[PDB]
Amino acid sequence: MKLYCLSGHPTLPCNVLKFKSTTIMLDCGLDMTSTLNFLPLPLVQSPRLSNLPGWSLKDLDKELKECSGHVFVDSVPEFCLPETELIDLSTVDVILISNYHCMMALPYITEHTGFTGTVYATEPTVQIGRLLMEELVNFIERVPKAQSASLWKNKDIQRLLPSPLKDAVEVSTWRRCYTMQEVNSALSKIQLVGYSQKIELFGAVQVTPLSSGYALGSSNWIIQSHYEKVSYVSGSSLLTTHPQPMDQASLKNSDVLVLTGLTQIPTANPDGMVGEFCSNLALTVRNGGNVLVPCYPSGVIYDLLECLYQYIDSAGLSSVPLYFISPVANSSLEFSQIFAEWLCHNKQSKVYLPEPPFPHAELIQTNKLKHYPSIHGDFSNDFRQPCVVFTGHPSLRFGDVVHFMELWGKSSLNTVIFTEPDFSYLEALAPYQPLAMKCIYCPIDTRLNFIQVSKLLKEVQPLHVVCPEQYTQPPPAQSHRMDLMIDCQPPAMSYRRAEVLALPFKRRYEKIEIMPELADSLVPMEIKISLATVSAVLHTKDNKHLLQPPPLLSGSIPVEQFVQTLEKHGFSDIKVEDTAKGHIVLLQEAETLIQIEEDSTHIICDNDEMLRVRLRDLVLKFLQKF
Amino acid sequence: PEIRVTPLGAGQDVGRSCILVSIAGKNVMLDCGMHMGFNDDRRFPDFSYITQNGRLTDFLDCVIISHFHLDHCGALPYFSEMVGYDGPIYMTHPTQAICPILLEDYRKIAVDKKGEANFFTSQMIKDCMKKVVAVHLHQTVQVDDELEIKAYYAGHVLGAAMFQIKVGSESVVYTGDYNMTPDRHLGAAWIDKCRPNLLITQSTYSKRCRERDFLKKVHETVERGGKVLIPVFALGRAQELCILLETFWERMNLKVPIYFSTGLTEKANHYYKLFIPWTNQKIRKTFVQRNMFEFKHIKAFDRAFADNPGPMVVFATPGHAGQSLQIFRKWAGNEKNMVIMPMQVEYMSFSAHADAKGIMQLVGQAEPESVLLVHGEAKKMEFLKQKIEQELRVNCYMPANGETVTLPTSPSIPVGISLGLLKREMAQGLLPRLLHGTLIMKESNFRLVSSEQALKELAEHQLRFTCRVHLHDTRKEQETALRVYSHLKSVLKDHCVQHLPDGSVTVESVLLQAAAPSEDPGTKVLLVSWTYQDEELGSFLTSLLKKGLPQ
Amino acid sequence: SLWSNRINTANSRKHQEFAGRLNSVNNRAELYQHL
Ligand SMILES: [Zn+2]
Ligand SMILES: [Zn+2]
């Protein structure tokens, strides 16, 4: 009935649903955009950052450093956590991981808040999430930096600071990176469940994940209570993507729907963007330059490299090498390979044959695709100048991407591409603004766009829809494109950060079970429809109400038939009179009185056994059991 | 409410497993096995049993397969294609990967016996399996409007699974081959407290010590330089032995060779390394470090029986004249050229199927009200049934091949309850009172509704009985009422903690108030109203009071 | 009764049958009768 929303991010939800005698935490959703304000963490300390100027402070300039008219925090990057203090996280019992992206910041909730419940997810999400968490922890800990700037977080300084920092919300809630020990602690509490696996919570609530189709392992959850269903929508894809195709039928007849994970910059067509990116790298290689592609080890690099090898085979530009650098690069590729059941029908048909699903294994065997754990790990010896590099974090605040783009920042011949629709690349390039490097922002967003989700809603027609207020408004970039506007015949209310919402659904009936003897106790009688009444003791265990054996009476008796029966019965002293306030008859057979009055009825019966038996028989002749 | 079960084949023996069940008029095909040695075309079940000719899809709408073993899926091709069937078939994905090549190899072996006149074809096997629908582990797929299929991990072989069938309150579980004892490369069977109506299981029947002895013998042979091979046809046991030998050599750090000959082994290795999640936890964890199925102890060329013997471990899969049968000619001929199969010979075979203790553990865990025994020796299942009767006093069955078993079942009636009534009931239960019941037949459903809520149907003309209890005593009214209140509150064990302003005391739902008579001053009469459930208790209490009081 | 009517509804949900169960006496069934 009550929905609590903690994260104000559109694509990184953190919501808590209070559902009957249970409460569900929906997703963690670490907000990575906070790190963009901080200074990047180079693998090798660059001279530029050391000689970078500070910034004026009335109250002591070492706290902050400024580049290109934008002040940056010269300290370790910190992450914006969801507003977890709104609800006591110890109370909640279940966490429903939707995808490896949404499960980020799970260590914070599991460890710091004292949460002691259970967590659920799919196996590819757990594995890829482990990879991402360990790789980001490795990036933070490779070159440790002190927490040397804290006073800047004060609201007074924030007001004194310009817009790129003043826009930040809940800076005080920002936190430093967790450690791998905390990651091991958090992942101990997780439980693995596959697609379309019903899970019962305390015999009261059924929860099931369904294939979202966005990335392998990524799932969309539903919550059911037989007479009440709540459906949660996350990042989903209807396109010809590698994972198992998105399921649409199961979400039908849903009372309340929660919408999350829509595309950032929805105007972009992913296929055209991939083709343009292929063209850009092709012309870069033709000019003799080098292409840097910061991206996760997630599905985006997988389908990107698929289309990429296909394109270069078409163009015959296979001479240059492929370099994918990450601490979990080999593990990510092999995990993608083995998880073949979670992929689409084409991949399942391929793996029915002995061949593996993806073809980059053939490249690895023929050595046409190469990957290394890091730069120092023999990649330096095997590195060649004309090449394309995928590495580092797409936030550009850490990872090997920092060193790579610092190396190639000066030369205009080289190129850098952007493919992750999760950050404003202008902000990302702000700490590295004075460069001749050619930057192209061509994000690929495989999630559902506004028209696709609108089509989904028109096909499903849920009673109510819940989503962040960002969707309810047009994007700030356009602010005029009314086509990119979620349309719903219901009001489709929304929310902001730390906004509590009350569900409109108020269904007031749950399930119960009955054993056959109680069912046989009824003796229905025709009226026009059947009528019945019973009386059983209520037994409940584990929120499972049961009825087993250890009612009102509606004896509508017509006046004329009753008079006929009474006359036929042969009782003496029968008097019939018609007077005001209804008909009143005085019977002296047993000092009985029968009164008929509008909106009232009184029944008199003596304690004589024979008279009681006759009255019971007379009532039973015209008794309706209801 | 009736359950219809009539398995044919393996009910009192091993092989030709085929269990036909119609739980609620929905025919479910749980297994389609075979048994070698039936040269009289008795390998497959009797397709005419469903009906002489006709479309199988008309009668059957669901088909289930346990695992790739021929005793569980051998008769699938001819039954599906030759008889004619295109209906839904559900089985696990690794089983779908392992099954076709095994069936094709068996078909080729049958061709070598020249009994292929009325046997399978490669093209029809491909057509049927291309039409088969895969299933994931624990995938609660709703195959019908009311029928759903849920699979559970078995661990007998890679891809083996046990299926939980549920429709309404009904519940049927069929497992086939499983094992509580975990394998060196597989996990043990696990299932929740499903407590199904019926359970179908197998009755067929120092693992680490045996592994130590086998490893020590192989180590002694290779250290001595002797050449010994392991002729084994089972894929699961072969892969387990390969993993065990590979990790043993890696731990010992020595570089002795070990290879495997048949390309079917290579195909099985490819399928195994592809399907990591259906294996032991060590495999899953070590996958992070590197692939474990890949090792320097790889494939075998052997110069076609001309590479000489040595400290070698080799695997051959004859059958019975298949594979490189010339391996025996090249080797043997002396005591040093040892050949060990299940100069000496020992039984290195590992019991993939668990013993009776595993079956006892599984039935104790699930605890069904009825059990069904198939796929084992007659003596074994009789002894196991007797032990079950002795230990648990839980109903069991020993159906023969073709024996029809019928089980009664209790179909729970799903209805809804008004929230206020349930809230009141829970409040009363928290801190003897029984709840009424009033339901109205609805369109394809039934709903319960409270008396106050039932009045919303308007009409609702309420009629209430008011019996009169007559007493003859000269004592006054109010003092007698107070005495009656004290007596009742003493008898009722302080169940009354409420009062009414007009000197009235109420228990449960009966009102006791003082009212004057109509016209007669010489007699005192009061009016009391109650329902039937209250009427019986009131009559009993009045009779008890009239039996004797200090009057 | 309500149970009686409900069981009739459940029984009314019927479909095809097999000739061998109809022919089955002593429960055990005959396979490959020609053989
Ligand atoms: Zn088996
Ligand atoms: Zn088996």
Tab-separated table of C-alpha atoms and ligand atoms in Angstrom, chain B residues 67 69 71-72 156-157 177 202, ligand 2:
chain	number	residue	atom	x	y	z
B	67	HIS	CA	18.115	-37.115	-18.572
B	69	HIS	CA	20.374	-41.927	-20.578
B	71	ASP	CA	16.735	-46.004	-20.330
B	72	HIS	CA	15.009	-42.604	-19.900
B	156	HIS	CA	22.797	-37.981	-11.486
B	157	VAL	CA	24.445	-36.636	-14.673
B	177	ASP	CA	17.771	-41.354	-11.468
B	202	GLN	CA	13.948	-45.431	-8.218
D	2	ZN	ZN	20.528	-42.071	-15.031
